[PDB]
Amino acid sequence: KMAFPSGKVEGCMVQVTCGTTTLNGLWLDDVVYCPRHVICTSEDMLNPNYEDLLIRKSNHNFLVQAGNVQLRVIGHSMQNCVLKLKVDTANPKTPKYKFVRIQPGQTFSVLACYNGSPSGVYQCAMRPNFTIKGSFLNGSCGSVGFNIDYDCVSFCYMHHMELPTGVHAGTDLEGNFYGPFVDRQTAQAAGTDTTITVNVLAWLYAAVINGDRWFLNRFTTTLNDFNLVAMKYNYEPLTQDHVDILGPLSAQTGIAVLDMCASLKELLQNGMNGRTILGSALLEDEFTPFDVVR
Amino acid sequence: MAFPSGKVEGCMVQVTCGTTTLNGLWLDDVVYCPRHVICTSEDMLNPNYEDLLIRKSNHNFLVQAGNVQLRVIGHSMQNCVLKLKVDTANPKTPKYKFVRIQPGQTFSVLACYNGSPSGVYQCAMRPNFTIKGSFLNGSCGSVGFNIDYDCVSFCYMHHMELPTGVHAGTDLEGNFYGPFVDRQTAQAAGTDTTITVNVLAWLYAAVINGDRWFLNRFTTTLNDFNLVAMKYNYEPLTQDHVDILGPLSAQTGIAVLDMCASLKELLQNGMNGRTILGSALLEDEFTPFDVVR
Numbered sequence: 001k002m003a004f005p006s007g008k009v010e011g012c013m014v015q016v017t018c019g020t021t022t023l024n025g026l027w028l029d030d031v032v033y034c035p036r037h038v039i040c041t042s043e044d045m046l047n048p049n050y051e052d053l054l055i056r057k058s059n060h061n062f063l064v065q066a067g068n069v070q071l072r073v074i075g076h077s078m079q080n081c082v083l084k085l086k087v088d089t090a091n092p093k094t095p096k097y098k099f100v101r102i103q104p105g106q107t108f109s110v111l112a113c114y115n116g117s118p119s120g121v122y123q124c125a126m127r128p129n130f131t132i133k134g135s136f137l138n139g140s141c142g143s144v145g146f147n148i149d150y151d152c153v154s155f156c157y158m159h160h161m162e163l164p165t166g167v168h169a170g171t172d173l174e175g176n177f178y179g180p181f182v183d184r185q186t187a188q189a190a191g192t193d194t195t196i197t198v199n200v201l202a203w204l205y206a207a208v209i210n211g212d213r214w215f216l217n218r219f220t221t222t223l224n225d226f227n228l229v230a231m232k233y234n235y236e237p238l239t240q241d242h243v244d245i246l247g248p249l250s251a252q253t254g255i256a257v258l259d260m261c262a263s264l265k266e267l268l269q270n271g272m273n274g275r276t277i278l279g280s281a282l283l284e285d286e287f288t289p290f291d292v293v294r
Numbered sequence: 295m296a297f298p299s300g301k302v303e304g305c306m307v308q309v310t311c312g313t314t315t316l317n318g319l320w321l322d323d324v325v326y327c328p329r330h331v332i333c334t335s336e337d338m339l340n341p342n343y344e345d346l347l348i349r350k351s352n353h354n355f356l357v358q359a360g361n362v363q364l365r366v367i368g369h370s371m372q373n374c375v376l377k378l379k380v381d382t383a384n385p386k387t388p389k390y391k392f393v394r395i396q397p398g399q400t401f402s403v404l405a406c407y408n409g410s411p412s413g414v415y416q417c418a419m420r421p422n423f424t425i426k427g428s429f430l431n432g433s434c435g436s437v438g439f440n441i442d443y444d445c446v447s448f449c450y451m452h453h454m455e456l457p458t459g460v461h462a463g464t465d466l467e468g469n470f471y472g473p474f475v476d477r478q479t480a481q482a483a484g485t486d487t488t489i490t491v492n493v494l495a496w497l498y499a500a501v502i503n504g505d506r507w508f509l510n511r512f513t514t515t516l517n518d519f520n521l522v523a524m525k526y527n528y529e530p531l532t533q534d535h536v537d538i539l540g541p542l543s544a545q546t547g548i549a550v551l552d553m554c555a556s557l558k559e560l561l562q563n564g565m566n567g568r569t570i571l572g573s574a575l576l577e578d579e580f581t582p583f584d585v586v587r
């Protein structure tokens with residue numbers, strides 16, 4: 001697992017405090033983005049009226065700091081589950097950036113932060129049930145997930161909560177949660193998780209590129225036939241987008257995506273028969289087709 | 295999980311000599327890079343580096359930091375690292391130190407190509423003084439490091455891939471880790487061993503994640519455990535290793551030698567299918583300090 005260099009995101013991290021509640025914010029040009037539950041108390045986390053907590057609030061109740069230096073808040077609004085604080089200084093370290101909503105299966109780096117300070121960077125996969133298996137502790141909220149393409153940081157994740165089971169949930173940078181979660185301090189269950197088929201196929205491609213190709217067969221399949229069988233093994237069905245992002249690996253190896261699906265269908269039905277693929281009896285599902293190139 | 299890489303990204307530059315390009319580290323007014331940049335092909339196999347270095351002019355070295363060229367006003371060599379004095383001081387130079395790490399210790403690697411950061415990841419110095427990185431052509435000069443408060447401890451610079459696919463390099467004084475040499479030859483490492491204290495830290499970790507199917511009631515002396523460990527090419531466990539595991543022992547209520555008893559069972563049986571924190575294999579590149587923080 002290889003994360004993206006974090007320096008461009010580090011230069012954007014700040015801290016936002018309401019009362020005693022401190023979490024992290026993302027400072028881009030003259031706007032600071034953070035999770036709205038920074039405005040909550042204990043007495044109101046069990047179920048908050050965010051619209052009502054927000055009316056009581058004024059610009060001068062928001063403490064925003066880069067380091068120990070205060071940024072003056074000159075405006076505030078709420079977009080879904082994210083708070084947007086307008087500040088009086090444009091971040092001179094603002095990279096080229098966009099806000100993207102990723103699909104389940106896709107990977108991203110997360111810059112874990114506490115009190116506006118980075119502690120670590122690591123590589124996460126958005127599971128099909130819209131959770132990530134991270135290392136977030138208290139005060140990690142507002143940490144973000146991202147990919148870097150050339151000069152451009154694509155922000156895709158902001159952290160909000162840990163689930164009873166120990167995995168994590170959050171939103172895009174527009175405040176829309178990934179999955180069926182809500183930012184209330186209630187017990188919330190992630191739907192049952194499935195294996196990320198497109199990434200397994202990416203991994204088989206990687207194994208072929210490295211000369212490990214015992215598992216290829218002379219058969220092929222339809223996308224519908226493969227999908228129905230894979231769901232019987234708790235694999236995700238494939239979309240048309242999945243097929244398309246396997247194109248470069250299909251072209252590199254000369255093995256059509258549906259031929260690879262047929263090889264996977266056989267692995268699913270018969271098993272490995274005590275063999276390995278890239279030195280592993282387990283099919284890895286957290287390397288995307290873009291990750292394999294790198 | 296790796297250290298944030300921003301402080302190091304701001305030091306990475308591109309160094310070129312001839313048709314060879316790799317990365318350099320630019321601290322204050324000196325750029326450090328692997329000396330084999332001053333090579334060719336007729337040289338690859340048995341290079342007399344002092345000899346090739348004396349034939350070199352300051353102006354043969356092209357240093358680019360972003361869109362900017364840096365003027366080399368001086369060059370010297372410290373073991374396998376070339377030190378290029380340049381006419382400008384990097385203003386992004388962080389607080390730093392140069393350190394040589396011990397096998398079993400971990401560090402972050404910022405992989406760079408043509409002076410540009412491309413990825414970051416966490417590695418351990420294997421006991422045979424290799425590292426299991428993903429380095430491709432042109433990644434030479436990439437560095438490994440740790441961060442303590444505001445200070446970057448640099449510990450590795452990347453020089454070569456071995457034919458098995460693992461990697462070899464030097465500290466920032468240019469001394470290789472391991473018996474490797476910066477000549478273009480197929481080199482083998484000594485037989486690698488598994489970092490025992492790290493496997494134990496990682497088992498304590500899975501426990502903290504409420505994963506404990508591997509535990510047991512059996513127990514073991516420290517010597518009897520080491521006898522089994524050595525049998526399976528695991529590093530011996532020292533009493534310092536035991537002391538270091540204390541915090542994780544306290545936090546889980548599992549004595550160090552109880553976890554050793556658990557590890558002994560796993561080595562002799564196997565996992566018999568089951569898995570620990572996702573892995574079918576015992577993971578040995580998380581240290582105790584790591585798993586804490």
Ligand SMILES: *C(=O)[C@H](C[C@@H]1CCNC1=O)NC(=O)[C@H](CC(C)C)NC(=O)OC[C@@H]1C[C@H]1c1cccc(F)c1
Nearest residue numbers: 037136137138141160161162163164183184185186187
């Ligand atoms: C950031 O503020 C923080 C990050 C959490 C803390 C621990 N690990 C993590 O990711 N997020 C919260 O505290 C969040 C605030 C809500 C308003 C969304 N709540 C949360 O994450 O709760 C975590 C424990 C598992 C929750 C739970 C279990 C059972 C019953 C509950 F009501 C809640």
Ligand SMILES: *C(=O)[C@H](C[C@@H]1CCNC1=O)NC(=O)[C@H](CC(C)C)NC(=O)OC[C@@H]1C[C@H]1c1cccc(F)c1
Nearest residue numbers: 330429430431434453454455456457476477478479480
């Ligand atoms: C950086 O310049 C580069 C990094 C390597 C390239 C491929 N992956 C990687 O990490 N370092 C070298 O190319 C290095 C230069 C020497 C002069 C030290 N040589 C190298 O990495 O060789 C790799 C293969 C195992 C070498 C080999 C096999 C057979 C015969 C040989 F003579 C050498």
